Write an enzyme that holds these catalytic residues in place. Structure first.
Site, PDB file in Angstrom:
ATOM      1  N   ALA B  15     -23.783  27.746  33.094  1.00 24.14           N
ATOM      2  CA  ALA B  15     -22.966  27.618  31.904  1.00 24.14           C
ATOM      3  C   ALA B  15     -23.630  26.784  30.836  1.00 24.14           C
ATOM      4  O   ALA B  15     -23.349  26.949  29.660  1.00 24.14           O
ATOM      5  CB  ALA B  15     -21.644  27.012  32.212  1.00 24.14           C
ATOM      6  N   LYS B  39     -29.769  13.706  38.087  1.00 25.78           N
ATOM      7  CA  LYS B  39     -29.408  14.966  38.769  1.00 25.78           C
ATOM      8  C   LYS B  39     -29.414  14.639  40.262  1.00 25.78           C
ATOM      9  O   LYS B  39     -30.385  14.912  40.972  1.00 25.78           O
ATOM     10  CB  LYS B  39     -30.398  16.094  38.410  1.00 25.78           C
ATOM     11  CG  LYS B  39     -30.085  17.461  39.063  1.00 25.78           C
ATOM     12  CD  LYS B  39     -29.003  18.276  38.437  1.00 25.78           C
ATOM     13  CE  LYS B  39     -28.912  19.610  39.114  1.00 25.78           C
ATOM     14  NZ  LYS B  39     -27.794  20.514  38.601  1.00 25.78           N
ATOM     15  N   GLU B 120     -25.478  14.898  36.036  1.00 32.00           N
ATOM     16  CA  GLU B 120     -25.220  16.338  36.187  1.00 32.00           C
ATOM     17  C   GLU B 120     -24.861  16.670  37.627  1.00 32.00           C
ATOM     18  O   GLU B 120     -25.620  16.289  38.515  1.00 32.00           O
ATOM     19  CB  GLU B 120     -26.382  17.170  35.703  1.00 32.00           C
ATOM     20  CG  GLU B 120     -26.139  18.681  35.865  1.00 32.00           C
ATOM     21  CD  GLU B 120     -27.241  19.540  35.302  1.00 32.00           C
ATOM     22  OE1 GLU B 120     -27.950  19.109  34.405  1.00 32.00           O
ATOM     23  OE2 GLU B 120     -27.334  20.704  35.769  1.00 32.00           O
ATOM     24  N   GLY B 121     -23.788  17.401  37.886  1.00 28.88           N
ATOM     25  CA  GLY B 121     -23.454  17.896  39.203  1.00 28.88           C
ATOM     26  C   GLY B 121     -24.183  19.171  39.531  1.00 28.88           C
ATOM     27  O   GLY B 121     -25.304  19.386  39.071  1.00 28.88           O
ATOM     28  N   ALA B 122     -23.649  19.980  40.451  1.00 33.46           N
ATOM     29  CA  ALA B 122     -24.250  21.233  40.803  1.00 33.46           C
ATOM     30  C   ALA B 122     -23.113  22.110  41.248  1.00 33.46           C
ATOM     31  O   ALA B 122     -22.157  21.640  41.904  1.00 33.46           O
ATOM     32  CB  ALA B 122     -25.237  21.023  41.948  1.00 33.46           C
ATOM     33  N   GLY B 155     -13.735  35.736  29.550  1.00 26.51           N
ATOM     34  CA  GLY B 155     -13.428  35.099  30.787  1.00 26.51           C
ATOM     35  C   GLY B 155     -13.321  33.612  30.714  1.00 26.51           C
ATOM     36  O   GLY B 155     -12.800  32.934  31.589  1.00 26.51           O
TER      37      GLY B 155
HETATM   38  N1  LIG Z   1     -26.704  26.885  23.830  1.00 25.69           N
HETATM   39  C1  LIG Z   1     -27.664  27.586  24.398  1.00 25.69           C
HETATM   40  N2  LIG Z   1     -28.501  28.342  23.656  1.00 25.69           N
HETATM   41  C2  LIG Z   1     -29.477  29.080  24.206  1.00 25.69           C
HETATM   42  N3  LIG Z   1     -29.778  29.094  25.492  1.00 25.69           N
HETATM   43  C3  LIG Z   1     -29.016  28.337  26.324  1.00 25.69           C
HETATM   44  C4  LIG Z   1     -27.940  27.597  25.797  1.00 25.69           C
HETATM   45  N4  LIG Z   1     -27.351  26.979  26.835  1.00 25.69           N
HETATM   46  C5  LIG Z   1     -27.993  27.316  27.952  1.00 25.69           C
HETATM   47  N5  LIG Z   1     -29.033  28.139  27.628  1.00 25.69           N
HETATM   48  C6  LIG Z   1     -29.965  28.766  28.620  1.00 25.69           C
HETATM   49  O1  LIG Z   1     -29.224  29.236  29.654  1.00 25.69           O
HETATM   50  C7  LIG Z   1     -29.910  28.905  30.879  1.00 25.69           C
HETATM   51  C8  LIG Z   1     -28.986  28.057  31.726  1.00 25.69           C
HETATM   52  O2  LIG Z   1     -28.710  26.807  31.051  1.00 25.69           O
HETATM   53  P1  LIG Z   1     -28.723  25.424  31.833  1.00 25.69           P
HETATM   54  O3  LIG Z   1     -28.448  24.385  30.802  1.00 25.69           O
HETATM   55  O4  LIG Z   1     -29.961  25.310  32.629  1.00 25.69           O
HETATM   56  O5  LIG Z   1     -27.503  25.598  32.775  1.00 25.69           O
HETATM   57  P2  LIG Z   1     -26.897  24.748  33.997  1.00 25.69           P
HETATM   58  O6  LIG Z   1     -25.447  24.833  33.971  1.00 25.69           O
HETATM   59  O7  LIG Z   1     -27.469  23.346  33.939  1.00 25.69           O
HETATM   60  N6  LIG Z   1     -27.563  25.539  35.324  1.00 25.69           N
HETATM   61  P3  LIG Z   1     -27.535  24.913  36.878  1.00 25.69           P
HETATM   62  O8  LIG Z   1     -27.783  23.425  36.790  1.00 25.69           O
HETATM   63  O9  LIG Z   1     -28.624  25.670  37.590  1.00 25.69           O
HETATM   64  O10 LIG Z   1     -26.227  25.104  37.472  1.00 25.69           O
HETATM   65  C9  LIG Z   1     -31.164  28.206  30.500  1.00 25.69           C
HETATM   66  O11 LIG Z   1     -32.309  29.144  30.438  1.00 25.69           O
HETATM   67  C10 LIG Z   1     -30.953  27.670  29.129  1.00 25.69           C
HETATM   68  O12 LIG Z   1     -32.134  27.482  28.330  1.00 25.69           O
HETATM   69 MG   LIG Z   2     -28.650  22.387  35.332  1.00 27.46          MG
END
Ligand SMILES: Nc1ncnc2c1ncn2[C@@H]1O[C@H](COP(=O)(O)OP(=O)(O)NP(=O)(O)O)[C@@H](O)[C@H]1O
Ligand SMILES: [Mg+2]
Ligand SMILES: Nc1ncnc2c1ncn2[C@@H]1O[C@H](COP(=O)(O)OP(=O)(O)NP(=O)(O)O)[C@@H](O)[C@H]1O
Ligand SMILES: [Mg+2]
Lengths: 224, 224
Positions: B15, B39, B120-122, B155
């Site tokens: 997300a 993390k 950050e959680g998971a 959603g």
């Molecule tokens: N606002 C945004 N604009 C463009 N790309 C984004 C944006 N937010 C997230 N992304 C992309 O979407 C993907 C997932 O984002 P990320 O911030 O890594 O999610 P996360 O919730 O930390 N994932 P996880 O820790 O594995 O549960 C990454 O490739 C980011 O670069």
């Molecule tokens: Mg992440």
């Protein structure tokens, strides 16, 4: 008692409500349990040009029991917008809020003529119908049992357990069932180990839909 | 008081927790609010061959404040399996259950040296850590404030409101923020109309992350 009623909700749009509803109704009907499929609220449709909405699919199945049924007998609030029903109603039919008392009467009328009435929702348990009601509120007003269909991908644990927390916090009988698609064996390696643990620790286990047609028929029909 | 602590959870994996955490920490640091990114539990990693996990990204940001930091200072339970942490731990490190008392001590130690500790959680709020605890339980034990990041697709209403129901049912200060990605204007037409209505009717509104860096900094830092 009149016919039983089972509401079908989901973790997410496209998790498999219609697929699973149709499979369960087919199984029940093949066992001599006369079962109708209803889709009272549907978004994302254009009936002038497309005849394969959920209500259309249900109608085809249903006319194996009653040739006289038509679309308007099984689906009552229908919108073009691909959105929550409240929003679609406010935009497309501002003077006709969704009336869940009307819906409750129409759905319960089918318990006269069917052993089981299956009601597919839309959107998810918290998706808004009216200014004051969501899908769960509708199911509660119906006094239906609940079958919540989950997707089968990574994330299903969190999604199932968020819905379990909401459902157990309300007065209704419910099951959660995972719609496990063909060609998915990651499920067994990634998610299933926790489903198995959870089920040893829960009085209401999460099942796999495809393993559970008899169990779910039993659930839908038991008691008064 | 020692430094504030903000837990970052999400509606779903991917997300945008890491994206939004890094943006918020950058903003706080640019305002002179000394902020670290942690993390504590990470799945799906292989540190022998890949240096772009969330902890690696956090580490790069964090070393702008402390060159001496290393990966093991900011991330403590790390697994190869792409799964819930409980499962990954049972498979890969059966004799070392995740110890959230240990985690709570390590995370709180950073409140000595930072104005804000972002954790950050998971997986999601209900994803299991240990046999008895999920991510929300960990955040509750931390006594952190909560920022729940939502995806921006169809959603999101259901997902946000399922999490809102769980969060409001517990004793913690939380915000929900939508991570609205560039090139998404369907959001404004499809989901935003209900977010706006919900916010008129709620004491705790759902915000858009990109509109809310100041609001969220304020939230994270307010009070004792
Ligand atoms: N606002 C945004 N604009 C463009 N790309 C984004 C944006 N937010 C997230 N992304 C992309 O979407 C993907 C997932 O984002 P990320 O911030 O890594 O999610 P996360 O919730 O930390 N994932 P996880 O820790 O594995 O549960 C990454 O490739 C980011 O670069
Ligand atoms: Mg992440
Ligand atoms: N077990 C399955 N095997 C293969 N395909 C499936 C399966 N379940 C669902 N599908 C497909 O996935 C898509 C979505 O399933 P469907 O049963 O229509 O979901 P839904 O939850 O009723 N969607 P909606 O009513 O729009 O919220 C359809 O194209 C189905 O044919
Ligand atoms: Mg459907």
């Amino acid at each position: 008692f009149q016919g039983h009623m089972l509401f079908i909700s989901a973790t997410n749009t496209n998790a498999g409500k219609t697929t699973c509803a149709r499979l369960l109704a087919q199984y029940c009907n093949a066992c001599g349990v006369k079962t109708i499929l209803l889709k009272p609220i549907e978004t994302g449709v254009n009936d002038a040009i497309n005849h394969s909405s959920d209500a259309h699919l249900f109608l085809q199945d249903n006319r194996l029991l009653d040739r006289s049924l038509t679309l308007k007998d099984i689906s009552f609030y229908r919108y073009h917008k691909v959105s929550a029903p409240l929003i679609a109603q406010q935009e497309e039919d501002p003077n006709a809020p969704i009336d869940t008392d009307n819906l409750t009467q129409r759905l319960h009328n089918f318990t006269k003529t069917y052993d089981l009435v299956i009601v597919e929702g839309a959107g998810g348990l918290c998706v808004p119908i009216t200014l004051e009601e969501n899908m769960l509120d509708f199911a509660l007003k119906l006094k239906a049992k609940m079958l919540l269909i989950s997707h089968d991908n990574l994330g299903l644990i969190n999604d199932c357990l968020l819905n379990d927390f909401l459902l157990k916090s309300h007065q209704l009988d419910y099951k959660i069932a995972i719609n496990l698609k063909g060609n998915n064996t990651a499920f067994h390696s990634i998610s299933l180990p926790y489903i198995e643990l959870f089920n040893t620790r829960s009085n209401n286990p999460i099942v796999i839909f495809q393993q559970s047609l008899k169990v779910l028929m039993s659930f839908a029909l038991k008691g008064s």
